[PDB]
Amino acid sequence: GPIPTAPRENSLMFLSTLPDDTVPAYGNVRTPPVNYLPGEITDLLQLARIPTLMAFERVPDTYVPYVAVPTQFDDRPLISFPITLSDPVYQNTLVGAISSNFANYRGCIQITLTFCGPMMARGKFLLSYSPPNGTQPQTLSEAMQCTYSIWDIGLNSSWTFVVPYISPSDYRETRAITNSVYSADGWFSLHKLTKITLPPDCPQSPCILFFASAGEDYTLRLPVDCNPSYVF
Amino acid sequence: GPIPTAPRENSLMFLSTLPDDTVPAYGNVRTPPVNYLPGEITDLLQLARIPTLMAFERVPDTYVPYVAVPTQFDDRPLISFPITLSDPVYQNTLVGAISSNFANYRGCIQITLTFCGPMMARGKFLLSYSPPNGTQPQTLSEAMQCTYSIWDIGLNSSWTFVVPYISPSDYRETRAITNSVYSADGWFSLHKLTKITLPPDCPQSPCILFFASAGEDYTLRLPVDCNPSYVF
Amino acid sequence: GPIPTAPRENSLMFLSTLPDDTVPAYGNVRTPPVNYLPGEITDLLQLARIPTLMAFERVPDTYVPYVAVPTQFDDRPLISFPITLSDPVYQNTLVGAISSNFANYRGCIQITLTFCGPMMARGKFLLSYSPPNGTQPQTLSEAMQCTYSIWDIGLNSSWTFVVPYISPSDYRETRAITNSVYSADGWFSLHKLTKITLPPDCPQSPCILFFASAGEDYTLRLPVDCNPSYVF
Amino acid sequence: NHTNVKFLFDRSRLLNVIKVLEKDAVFPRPFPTQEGAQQDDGYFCLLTPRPTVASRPATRFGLYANPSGSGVLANTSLDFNFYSLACFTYFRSDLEVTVVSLEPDLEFAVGWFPSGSEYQASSFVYDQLHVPFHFTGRTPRAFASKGGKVSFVLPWNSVSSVLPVRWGGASKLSSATRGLPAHADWGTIYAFVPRPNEKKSTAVKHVAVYIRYKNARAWCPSMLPFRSYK
């Protein structure tokens, strides 16, 4: 029978994310097989898992991906930072870059450390995490109350650390326009437990490095459009 | 029920290569059977396979489809050219004409030669191909390193030659806007191996002809619109 | 789901010969049965088969559907004409009228003749057909070479004649804008074979009539729109 | 599979541009034609790849490279693409026609008849309004809204079995020019406006034509046009 024309409510429109396909233009084409190329990629998680090196601004424009253990001693932690992907420290890591292109994340964060120093020197280190509170903890005494672990210098050279995923929701804000409970998750710090040993005639100022990677349960959501600032 | 009108994104358009059909106009027609016509054609390959004669500009506006073996001798080849369908030498062959109406080609190129001269004369000839390099080879010594074959004058009169298909891709550019690896494929040349025999009272300056044809694996792709220059 | 609106290429158009139907307007109607009417018609061939009478302009505005055998004798045929439906002779026959409303025809043409004269008179007649050539044949000698038949006056009174369908195509032009091979098909003629007998006291100048009809294989094609000249 | 003749000859290409009718008009008359006639040109076009002049079949192609002169100019056309495409002594296929306006926001209709027929002339007068008879007839007439788009497919309509690419015979015994075919076409096309002649306007309108071949076949391969070494 004739077209039982049922007009559509809002046809004659253009939509960005319309899933369906369109009319083919120059069909009946053949392509060269590409099976010979190895290293296929499936999802960004493959790159997100591989660790990389963070950095910090040089202590009083040169950021540094390493930290050297000082000879001086104080009760304050030697290096600490908030766990917030918007911070500069993650501003070049693969995980941070990938996360910057999503609304929210979900899962744990994995941290790795490495030592680079003399032969006959030994020491002890303490790792800790502190959820958010009135202000960042300062004294090793206060930190000790929070969750912590013992890392010996000599047992191994990389005592891997992972921050557990804790939050009163199902996800968290990838970027923090304004400080909020769901955005920030406290801080993480390292404390020198005891004075290290300085053997005969060995160099001084050992070097320590830190690496970050996404946990096995890491997941992003709600893609967005990028900031084109990097062109400048 | 009523037309559940689902408006289409970009209807009310005219497209050149729309595959579907249209409304019939004057259906219910009968036609005279045409089975009595022989010589049906299926694909252009049928014409592309049949060989034809190339030509060259007269040695110092008359191109010549033949070459005569000279009495003088030199180490340089007597006749050579690049294997590039855009060259004038192919500019009237059936294969060249057909290829001119496509984006790219694929397969081998077949070449044939014929002799036309005296009775009691004999000689030897050498055929060779040279992939691209800094510049076209000049000396028969340099050419000999490349792939070559021996064609005797007296064994037969047409020692067929085929250039193998070699390229770092799946196809090659039919026309070369700018010289490129995928476009040019070196050159082909013929060398006089030894002085031919001049018998009593026979005429001089024998004549040789060359023919080109597409190989069994020859194939074109990506049709285009023609240049209408030939009308002028 | 919603209308997956697929806009049509050229909708919102009016076409003369669109075959499909349209929306009913005042359905649920009943009609008086018409089985009581006899003489149903199926195709125009039914009328095309029934013979009719041609005519000719009066020998020096009154066309005549009869011809009378003259007393004078000449080698030229007494009545002849080209076999071309555009000629005036067919310009009122049913077959001619029907054919005038089509692009082309196909099949044989049937001709019938009748005599009307005295009682004790006898004679002989010769019927012939001549395909096209340089010019219409004139002498009975020349005509005799072509196809012909013998019609005796006294054996019967209507020696039916049919022109065979001969042409180098599948059809022929119903109307001839310009003379062409496919349009004209020569001529047909009748010749007086021998002097007829004039018995005592019978009237003179017998009368002969001719009728035309479409052959069993007659067929038209490609309908057209009529010339409305007849209104004037 | 690109080499297949069917896969090659199934795309639309421009053919010619024509004006829009505004009256009955007189059809062009055969050659040679003397001056003073009322036949008008540039309104009717024949559907044929082969060369044509002044809406009629032709043998030799010409072009008006010299603009200046005196007399009446003529139209010409030839399917450059088809001729350059390949070689085939014989050919047959259904011809598809499509038309698009070349003026701002125009509406019109199109009219066609097959080979062997000819333009229908004369006009009626309704309530003191004159209208050509070509409005109504036995053959299709198409109608489209403003902007405009026309499409349909015509079946084969010529007596000859196929279409000869390069023919060399003659059509008639006397005066027939050698090699000039007879009915190698699909008919004639024309455009007109559904308005009375009494409301004719001076401004001219122009329209293009596009055609497409469907279900093509060929026989008896042939040669291809030469190209210079200049």
Decide if domain C1-232 falls under CATH 2.60.120.20: yes
How far off is chain D from B147, nearest CA to CA, in Å? 32
Q: Is C221 on the interface with D (CB under 8 A)?
A: no
H helix or E strand, kind and range, residue C189: strand C187-194
- Contact at CB, C15 and D152, closer than 8 angstroms: yes
The residues with which D113 forms a beta bridge, in sequence order, are D188
Rounded to 5°, angle at Cα B43 from D90 and A24? 110
CA–CA distances in Å: residue C28 to residues B2, C25, C31 = 21, 10, 10
Peptide-bond breaks in chain D following residues (C–N over 2.5 A): none
- Contact at CB, A7 and C3, closer than 8 angstroms: yes
Q: How were these coordinates obtained?
A: cryo-EM
Which residue of chain C is at minimal alpha-carbon distance from A3?
Answer: C22
Strands (E), chain D: 13-19, 45-46, 52-53, 56-57, 76-77, 90-101, 109-113, 123-126, 129-132, 141-144, 150-154, 163-164, 188-192, 206-219
The 3 state secondary structure assigned to C199-231 is CCCCCCCCEEEEEEEECCCCEEEEECCCCHHHH
CA–CA distances in Å: residue B80 to residues B77, B210, D140 = 7, 12, 62
Burial C154-183 (b: 16+ CB within 10 A, else e): eeeeebebebeeeeebbbbbbbbeeebbbb
Distance CA B155, CA A86 (A): 83
Distance CA C99, CA C79 (A): 24
Backbone angles phi, psi at B49, to 5 degrees: -75, -35
* Domain segments of chain A as ranges: 1-232
Distance CA C191, CA C140 (A): 7
- Contact at CB, C5 and A20, closer than 8 angstroms: no
Backbone angles phi, psi at B24, to 5 degrees: -65, 150
**In contact, B106 and B170? CB cutoff 8 Å:** yes
Tokens of residue B192, six digits: 């006089």
**In contact, D96 and C9? CB cutoff 8 Å:** no
H helix or E strand, kind and range, residue A172: strand A172-173
Q: How many C-alpha atoms does A228 have within 13 Å on its Cβ side?
A: 0
Candidates D15, D61, D77, D84, partner chain B, best to mutate (most B CBs within 10 A) = D84
Which residue of chain C is at minimal alpha-carbon distance from A23?
Answer: C6
Which residues of C fall within a CB distance of 8 Å from B10?
Answer: 7
Nearest of C209, C193, C207 to residue C70 by alpha carbon: C207
Give the full edge-to-edge strand order of the sheet including A219-223.
A172-173, A102-106, A219-223
Instruction: Give me the residue from D133, D152, D182 closest to C180, CB to CB.
Output: D182
Q: How many CB pairs under 8 A join B and D?
A: 109
Which residues of B fall within a CB distance of 8 Å from A19?
Answer: none
CA–CA distances in Å: residue B30 to residues B33, D158, D163, D188, D202 = 9, 11, 16, 20, 45
- Contact at CB, C9 and B7, closer than 8 angstroms: no
Which residue of chain C is at minimal alpha-carbon distance from D141?
Answer: C16
How far off is chain D from B220, nearest CA to CA, in Å? 7
Distance CA C145, CA C133 (A): 13
- Contact at CB, D144 and C12, closer than 8 angstroms: yes
Which residues of B fall within a CB distance of 8 Å from A8?
Answer: 4-7
Which residue of chain C is at minimal alpha-carbon distance from B26?
Answer: C17
Instruction: Give me the residue from C3, C4, C23 closest to A2, CB to CB.
Output: C23
Instruction: Give me the residue from D120, D142, D157 closest to C15, CB to CB.
Output: D142
- Contact at CB, C170 and B7, closer than 8 angstroms: no
Q: Is A62 on the interface with D (CB under 8 A)?
A: no
- Contact at CB, B7 and A3, closer than 8 angstroms: no
